[PDB]
Amino acid sequence: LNVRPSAQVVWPIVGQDILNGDVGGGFHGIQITSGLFQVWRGWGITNSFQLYCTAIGGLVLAGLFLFAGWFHYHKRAPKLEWFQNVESMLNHHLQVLLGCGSLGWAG
Amino acid sequence: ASFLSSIFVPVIGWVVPIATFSFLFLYIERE
Amino acid sequence: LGADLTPCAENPAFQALAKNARNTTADPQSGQKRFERYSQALCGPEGYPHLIVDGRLDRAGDFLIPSILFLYIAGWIGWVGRAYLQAIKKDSDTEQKEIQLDLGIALPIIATGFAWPAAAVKELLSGELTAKDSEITVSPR
Amino acid sequence: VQRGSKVRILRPESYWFQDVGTVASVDQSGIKYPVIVRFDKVNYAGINTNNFAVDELIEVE
Amino acid sequence: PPYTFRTGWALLLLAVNFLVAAYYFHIIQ
Amino acid sequence: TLSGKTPLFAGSTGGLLTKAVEEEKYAITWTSPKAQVFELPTGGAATMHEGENLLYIARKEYGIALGGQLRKFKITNYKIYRILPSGETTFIHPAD
Amino acid sequence: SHTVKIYDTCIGCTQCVRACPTDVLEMVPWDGCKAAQVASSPRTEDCVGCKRCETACPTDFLSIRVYLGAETTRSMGLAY
Amino acid sequence: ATKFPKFSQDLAQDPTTRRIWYAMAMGNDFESHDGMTEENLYQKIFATHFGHLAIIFLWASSLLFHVAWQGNFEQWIKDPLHVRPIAHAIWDPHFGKPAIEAFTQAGANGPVNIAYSGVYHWWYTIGMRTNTELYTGSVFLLLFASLFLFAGWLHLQPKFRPSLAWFKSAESRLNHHLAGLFGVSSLAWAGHLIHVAIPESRGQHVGWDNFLSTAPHPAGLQPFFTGNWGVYAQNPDTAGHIFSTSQGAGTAILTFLGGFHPQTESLWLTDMAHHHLAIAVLFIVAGHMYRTNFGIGHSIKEMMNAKTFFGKPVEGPFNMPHQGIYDTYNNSLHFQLGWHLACLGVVTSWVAQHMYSLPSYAFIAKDYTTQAALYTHHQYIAIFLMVGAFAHGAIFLVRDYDPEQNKGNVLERVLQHKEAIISHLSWVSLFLGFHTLGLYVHNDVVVAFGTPEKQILIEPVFAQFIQAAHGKVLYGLDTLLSNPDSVAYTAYPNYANVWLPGWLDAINSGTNSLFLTIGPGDFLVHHAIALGLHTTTLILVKGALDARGSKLMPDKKDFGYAFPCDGPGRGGTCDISAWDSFYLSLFWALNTVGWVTFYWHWKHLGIWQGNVAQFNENSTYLMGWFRDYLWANSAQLINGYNPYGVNNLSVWAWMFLFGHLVWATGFMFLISWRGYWQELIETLVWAHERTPIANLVRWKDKPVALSIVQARVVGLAHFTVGYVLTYAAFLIASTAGKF
Amino acid sequence: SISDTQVYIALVVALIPGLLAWRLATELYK
Ligand code: CLA
Ligand code: CLA
Numbered sequence A: 001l002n003v004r005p006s007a008q009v010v011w012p013i014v015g016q017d018i019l020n021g022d023v024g025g026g027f028h029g030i031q032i033t034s035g036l037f038q039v040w041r042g043w044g045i046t047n048s049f050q051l052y053c054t055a056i057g058g059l060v061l062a063g064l065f066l067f068a069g070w071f072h073y074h075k076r077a078p079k080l081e082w083f084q085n086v087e088s089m090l091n092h093h094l095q096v097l098l099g100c101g102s103l104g105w106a107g
Numbered sequence B: 001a002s003f004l005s006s007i008f009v010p011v012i013g014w015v016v017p018i019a020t021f022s023f024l025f026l027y028i029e030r031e
Numbered sequence C: 001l002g003a004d005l006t007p008c009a010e011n012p013a014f015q016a017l018a019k020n021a022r023n024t025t026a027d028p029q030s031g032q033k034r035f036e037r038y039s040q041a042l043c044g045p046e047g048y049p050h051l052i053v054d055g056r057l058d059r060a061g062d063f064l065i066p067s068i069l070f071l072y073i074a075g076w077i078g079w080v081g082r083a084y085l086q087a088i089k090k091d092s093d094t095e096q097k098e099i100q101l102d103l104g105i106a107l108p109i110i111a112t113g114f115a116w117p118a119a120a121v122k123e124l125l126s127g128e129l130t131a132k133d134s135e136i137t138v139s140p141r
Numbered sequence D: 001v002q003r004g005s006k007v008r009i010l011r012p013e014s015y016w017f018q019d020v021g022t023v024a025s026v027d028q029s030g031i032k033y034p035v036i037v038r039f040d041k042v043n044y045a046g047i048n049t050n051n052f053a054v055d056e057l058i059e060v061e
Numbered sequence E: 001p002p003y004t005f006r007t008g009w010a011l012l013l014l015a016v017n018f019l020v021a022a023y024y025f026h027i028i029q
Numbered sequence F: 001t002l003s004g005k006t007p008l009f010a011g012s013t014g015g016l017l018t019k020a021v022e023e024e025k026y027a028i029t030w031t032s033p034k035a036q037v038f039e040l041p042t043g044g045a046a047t048m049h050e051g052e053n054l055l056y057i058a059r060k061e062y063g064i065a066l067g068g069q070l071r072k073f074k075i076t077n078y079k080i081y082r083i084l085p086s087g088e089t090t091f092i093h094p095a096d
Numbered sequence G: 001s002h003t004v005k006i007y008d009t010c011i012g013c014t015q016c017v018r019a020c021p022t023d024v025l026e027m028v029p030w031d032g033c034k035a036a037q038v039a040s041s042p043r044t045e046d047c048v049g050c051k052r053c054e055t056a057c058p059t060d061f062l063s064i065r066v067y068l069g070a071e072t073t074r075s076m077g078l079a080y
Numbered sequence H: 001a002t003k004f005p006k007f008s009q010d011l012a013q014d015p016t017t018r019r020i021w022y023a024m025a026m027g028n029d030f031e032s033h034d035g036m037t038e039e040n041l042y043q044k045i046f047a048t049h050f051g052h053l054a055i056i057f058l059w060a061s062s063l064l065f066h067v068a069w070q071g072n073f074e075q076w077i078k079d080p081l082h083v084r085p086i087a088h089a090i091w092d093p094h095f096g097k098p099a100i101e102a103f104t105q106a107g108a109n110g111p112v113n114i115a116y117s118g119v120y121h122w123w124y125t126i127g128m129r130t131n132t133e134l135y136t137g138s139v140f141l142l143l144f145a146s147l148f149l150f151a152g153w154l155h156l157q158p159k160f161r162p163s164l165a166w167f168k169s170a171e172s173r174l175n176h177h178l179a180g181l182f183g184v185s186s187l188a189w190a191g192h193l194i195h196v197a198i199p200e201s202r203g204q205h206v207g208w209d210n211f212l213s214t215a216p217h218p219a220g221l222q223p224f225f226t227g228n229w230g231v232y233a234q235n236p237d238t239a240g241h242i243f244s245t246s247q248g249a250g251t252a253i254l255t256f257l258g259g260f261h262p263q264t265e266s267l268w269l270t271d272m273a274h275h276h277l278a279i280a281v282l283f284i285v286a287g288h289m290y291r292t293n294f295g296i297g298h299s300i301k302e303m304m305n306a307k308t309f310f311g312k313p314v315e316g317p318f319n320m321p322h323q324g325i326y327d328t329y330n331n332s333l334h335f336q337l338g339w340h341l342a343c344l345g346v347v348t349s350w351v352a353q354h355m356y357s358l359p360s361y362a363f364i365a366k367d368y369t370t371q372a373a374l375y376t377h378h379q380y381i382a383i384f385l386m387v388g389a390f391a392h393g394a395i396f397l398v399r400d401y402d403p404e405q406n407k408g409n410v411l412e413r414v415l416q417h418k419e420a421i422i423s424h425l426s427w428v429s430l431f432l433g434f435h436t437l438g439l440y441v442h443n444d445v446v447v448a449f450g451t452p453e454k455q456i457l458i459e460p461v462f463a464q465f466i467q468a469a470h471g472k473v474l475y476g477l478d479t480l481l482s483n484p485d486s487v488a489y490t491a492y493p494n495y496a497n498v499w500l501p502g503w504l505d506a507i508n509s510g511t512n513s514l515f516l517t518i519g520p521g522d523f524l525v526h527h528a529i530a531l532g533l534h535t536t537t538l539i540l541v542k543g544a545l546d547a548r549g550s551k552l553m554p555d556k557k558d559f560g561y562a563f564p565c566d567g568p569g570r571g572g573t574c575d576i577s578a579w580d581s582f583y584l585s586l587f588w589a590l591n592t593v594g595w596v597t598f599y600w601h602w603k604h605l606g607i608w609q610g611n612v613a614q615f616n617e618n619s620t621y622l623m624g625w626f627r628d629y630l631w632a633n634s635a636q637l638i639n640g641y642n643p644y645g646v647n648n649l650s651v652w653a654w655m656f657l658f659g660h661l662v663w664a665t666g667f668m669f670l671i672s673w674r675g676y677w678q679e680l681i682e683t684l685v686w687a688h689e690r691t692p693i694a695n696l697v698r699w700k701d702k703p704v705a706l707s708i709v710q711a712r713v714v715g716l717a718h719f720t721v722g723y724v725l726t727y728a729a730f731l732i733a734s735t736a737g738k739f
Numbered sequence I: 001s002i003s004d005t006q007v008y009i010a011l012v013v014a015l016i017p018g019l020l021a022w023r024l025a026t027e028l029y030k
């Protein structure tokens, strides 16, 4: 109710340290408006270490997407008829991505 | 004689464009 | 003097701005060391240093000193870029070397040209600086 | 002139006016502009060749 | 050629530029 | 006369207009090897017949834009007439 | 209509005849150029001012030129 | 196939609605009409010039009649410093009763419009005192405008119609117009001041009845012919002269005090009388110079074609080839029209620069909104006269110019090195813009970071000097009429500085607009003005010089002045014509005069309110312009009508929104171009021939979209009208709501 | 202000340029 959501501490070089204003809580920074503190509380994150292992876990998950883009093009690329299985695509993407994604999140 | 505003302003507001436009429309469309 | 210019060290408006200094960098006295150097300028009725671009040798730090420091650098940006376009014109590709820099030719051009006032007079006095007007394309009059 | 001679252009409406060309081929009888000059820089249309008269050029080699 | 008529009037006008600056630098009063 | 078949389409809102009654009207004839689907310059798809066809078009621009579309069907026989409202048919494409 | 001037500098490339969409242009034989034909515009009452014919001509400067003149119904491109 | 327009068979054979629009923008273009010969051209322009001349006198008579009949001029004489003038009256049927009560103002019976054009101050100065002189001068201008309407009709009849050689007699116009139109009229106005206006300035009525009996001077024309002209400069109006009364009056009619009247804060009427008298002698002498049928005088065609300076062979005058320029000015009408608009465009702004600093009208320095409007009016008039100078100068190079007659001369040598003119014009535009915008944004960031002392503030030390070389002690430069030991201060051989004690009283007071005190905020805006003058000139000169063709498109002279493009070929040629460089420049010309009139208006809002510190602090960075001038002053304006009521500013609050809408409408003609709209109208042509009842009626002209050159006119028209009306509603009501 | 009589003199005198403007604008052609 009183502490303002803030990240992005500004380097103090040219007088732009005045952008690090007092948001409350002994902390000086830019009052964010993206609402990530509501999301992280809505996820149930309590301390900082749960944010580190999520962010470090995201950097690993960003590396698997970038590796598979190399792999599924420069190494093992699909044929045409793999793409035109739109009946087979809609069954996996509606069930496993959306349905099982929201079933797991319901858990 | 401030009543002349009641007789010049509606003539220039209404009668002058109606007389002008109805002349010019029949003049530009004239073989 | 100057004019409408008392020195900043004599103004009560400048010394009132001195008591509420805002620190530029994380240096805790960077707000204070800023104003001991601005005390030699000429602050008007507001308390702000007004510069003098005249050419007076007591106000040479305003515009006389930074003009010499600029014109040495910015002419050298354009002198190096001129000498590289002379070099790559006499090559086979001449358009690969424009977007995709011939770094083995560019770096001897960059390190050389710091004596361009000793250079740029020699092309002027020999007339190699310019081109003939009978050799440049012109519009129909 | 001959295949490989640098020439210059005096046609004012041309793009390569007062520029250095290179004669690619000279014809014999017709057109009145029988000299193909392969230029090195392109005009706005993107081409770099044109036809010119015999007296239109200035040989510089 | 050494352009006598061009440089003759440019040095006349530049002498007017230097004369007004002498009033501004208190050389002449 | 002209004496050509009319291609298979359900009618368009492009079609012909009041100019076809008043000022002029064009018409393109081509003899097709078979029946297939082409495009109308009025808009949409149609179906040509086999043998001599006929399409009453609005302007001359349509028939030469159509004739380029017919060139990739191996059809280089298209002839545009100019049908005046007095009945005066003028052969205009080609020149001979 | 418009005005299509064809100068004597073209080479008989037949790129301007194959680009005018109302078929104003045609080739006539002419003993000047190497291809021995010059473009001609005998049907300039059909020209719509498109300047596709000036875009397709190789020669510098253009041998063909369209001068935009008085605009009748055929040159406005009106279907109505 | 109609017979309209009469002047063109190519337009009258147009089935579309293009026939209608191109009649309007080719109607007064007399040179492109069908069958127009050369001598028929001049004879038609000369009688047309009687038509525009008689509009001006009919216009100026309605200023007199609507003030005499509906204004409060006789009530304004009693106290000009608080009585608020009246232009005309409102008869609007659409008004509500709280909008009749809000405009019933200035002590009137009905709704009246407060005059902000200052014509009460000009008529009160020149002697007019009651409502009958205003009516008498009104009725005189009805007859004097009909004397020109008859003159234009008379000089079109066949034996009264002048020949061609009468028009091209240029040495005889210069003798008659300089001596007579300039010189006698300046002499006549000096006769009006001395006989009438200066005695009316002293409480002494001189009208048409008693001007032949009364003399302006008790000496009475005896000291004129004997050479004792110093009698005319005896005891002047003193420093306690209450205007239009006999207190502190004088007998002098030609005096040379210099400076301002102490009450009205205007120029002395005795100074203006010796002025227009001295101007009259300098012009009648100037009008006896050129050669006419009397075998004496200078000849301009011989002055151009001269090649010999005292035996020395030269190329011409100043050793510059000016041959053929006499046959270039005089034979062409677009060279003349392009020239004289530059001459009239210089003086129009030069009028405005000298009327806020040197007011010449009684009690006009204290009526603020009338003075803020007269500066901004004649500045925008000077804008169009300069853009049209280059515009009609560039019509000359396309249409009238002949390179063979003009071969080798000075106007040919400009067209040779034209790529050197445009390059160095492109340099100064970029050299100023990169470093003037750089120093505003530098000052914006520095103030925003709470450390405003890091601003780059430059004193204008080269215009500090001129104001101190004209006699301002306030800076302490101590030169040249501020140095009391100077040779220029004393006028050493003759000591005849009569003007100088009265000049130094005016320039050293802080109660006028005479040589305003300048600081670092005024440094940046004069270099921002210089950005706007060199960039508007860049567009206009480059469109003038490249008007006859260039590399991307040769032979542009074969296509006339206004043609859209040359197609999408060669990369495309959108806005290539010489008309299109007129077109781009009027965005800059309206911009630059915005800068010169935002800066004029906000420096005087500190003088008129006593707060000079608001401008000098805040005009160095661009938020202080945006906040303390645009945001803060539009609070009186926008509350002209709110859900609580109205007041007398509700027209200007409505016109301010009206100007924002005409401005924004003109973007539609400029972002969106034609071919979107012809494909939209062809669906409306369809759905009108199909609707069953509404296809009883049908067009005569086929509806087509506006042409490419046309909606650049129509787009610039909505842009310019909305640019004018927005600022003119902000200039008035932010000043007339604060006083 | 001015009297009610003087306004009608100004209107009748204004017909004299109103007639002459119609003569000039039609002598300059249609
Ligand atoms: C061009 C000059 C001019 C203008 C813009 C106005 C403007 C106005 N007059 Mg005014 N007026 C003028 C000259 C002018 N006056 C002169 C010379 C006279 C003396 C005859 C009058 C006598 C007069 C009376 C008696 C009344 C007005 C009224 C009005 C107002 C309403 C408009 C109207 O009914 O017109 C009235 C017009 C006339 C009576 C005749 C017009 C006379 C001029 C000379 C014609 C000018 C025509 C113009 C040059 C043609 C060019 C058109 C242009 C678009 C190209 C408006 C403030 C009315 C008013 O105040 O309402 C509150 C009203 O009652 N005027
Ligand atoms: C090789 C670099 C170079 C040099 C020596 C010049 C020299 C000149 N230019 Mg030019 N110019 C250049 C690059 C260069 N230009 C580029 C890249 C552009 C496109 C942005 C322009 C755009 C330009 C315009 C629009 C104008 C000039 C003008 C001028 C003249 C006056 C100086 C001036 O106003 O600077 C102008 C400088 C700029 C507008 C910006 C400079 C561009 C960058 C920042 C510098 C280039 C450095 C280069 C990339 C380094 C390469 C090094 C190499 C070893 C790889 C002068 C002949 C003016 C003129 O005609 O005056 C008579 C003029 O109006 N030039």
Ligand code: CLA
Pocket: H045, H046, H049, H050, H053, H166, H167, H169, H172, H173, H176, H177, H179, H180, H181, H182, H185
């Ligand atoms: C002495 C004789 C004489 C006089 C008085 C005139 C007068 C005039 N001639 Mg002219 N003319 C003459 C002889 C004369 N001519 C001869 C002999 C020839 C043949 C060789 C010509 C050939 C000729 C042509 C071909 C034309 C004229 C035109 C004109 C008119 C110019 C436009 C105008 O009214 O501007 C009035 C200008 C002034 C009163 C001076 C203005 C000075 C500057 C611009 C402003 C200064 C004012 C100052 C700042 C204060 C103003 C403030 C106040 C308003 C509040 C004007 C009525 C033109 C015209 O319109 O025809 C009717 C035209 O086309 N004349």
Ligand code: CLA
Pocket: H024, H025, H026, H027, H028, H029, H030, H337, H341, H384, H385, H387, H388, H389, H391, H392, H395, H561, H562, H579, H582, H717, H721
């Ligand atoms: C005394 C000065 C003067 C004179 C005699 C002329 C005379 C001429 N000019 Mg020129 N001109 C002038 C000043 C002058 N101009 C100025 C000051 C400019 C700069 C703005 C120009 C710019 C200019 C251009 C760019 C062109 C001309 C052209 C012409 C020629 C034909 C004019 C025409 O077709 O009118 C037709 C008139 C119109 C289309 C009028 C429409 C514009 C009106 C004024 C908009 C008004 C908006 C609206 C009424 C406001 C209502 C407000 C309300 C909503 C609240 C003619 C020789 C043209 C030409 O081809 O030359 C041969 C041409 O291309 N002139």
Ligand code: CLA
Pocket: C066, C067, C068, C070, C071, C073, C074, C075, C077, C078, C079, H427, H430, H431, H432, H434, H435
């Ligand atoms: C401190 C900050 C600062 C910054 C960021 C800039 C930034 C810029 N300046 Mg600037 N300038 C500054 C301070 C600054 N200036 C000061 C203090 C001075 C006074 C000496 C100048 C004087 C100056 C000039 C005179 C010019 C610039 C130009 C430029 C632009 C291109 C510069 C360049 O290297 O192009 C790369 C360089 C080239 C492409 C060619 C070299 C051209 C150089 C700049 C000129 C040197 C030639 C010769 C020795 C001197 C010419 C005569 C001159 C005295 C009139 C760029 C936007 C140029 C410009 O506006 O172009 C449109 C330009 O002509 N500046």
Ligand SMILES: CC1=C(/C=C/C(C)=C/C=C/C(C)=C/C=C/C=C(C)/C=C/C=C(C)/C=C/C2=C(C)CCCC2(C)C)C(C)(C)CCC1
Pocket: A054, A057, A058, A061, A100, A101, A103, A104, A105
């Ligand atoms: C946040 C985040 C993250 C994380 C994530 C995670 C943590 C995940 C997890 C996941 C999960 C954890 C999932 C889960 C899911 C689940 C599910 C999906 C299940 C299912 C099941 C089923 C389906 C069952 C059924 C059945 C039954 C009941 C009986 C009969 C038989 C059967 C078997 C059928 C990351 C790192 C990425 C990074 C970014 C952010």
Ligand SMILES: CC1=C(C/C=C(\C)CCC[C@H](C)CCC[C@H](C)CCCC(C)C)C(=O)c2ccccc2C1=O
Pocket: H668, H669, H670, H672, H673, H674, H675, H677, H678, H704, H705, H706, H707, H708, H711
């Ligand atoms: C709206 C628009 C049209 C369509 C607009 C048309 C066809 C005209 C719309 C206005 C109609 C005709 C009513 C006009 C009424 C005006 C508000 C006042 C007219 C009075 C004067 C003519 C005296 C174009 O054809 C066009 C073409 C090229 C660039 C931009 C545009 C463009 O912006």
Ligand code: SF4
Pocket: G006, G009, G010, G011, G012, G013, G014, G015, G016, G017, G037, G038, G039, G056, G057, G058, G059, G063, G064
């Ligand atoms: S005009 Fe162009 S397209 Fe036609 S023959 Fe000549 S070069 Fe070929």
Ligand code: SF4
Pocket: G002, G004, G019, G020, G021, G022, G023, G024, G025, G046, G047, G048, G049, G050, G051, G052, G053, G054, G066
């Ligand atoms: S106007 Fe141009 S594009 Fe159209 S048919 Fe003629 S040559 Fe071709």
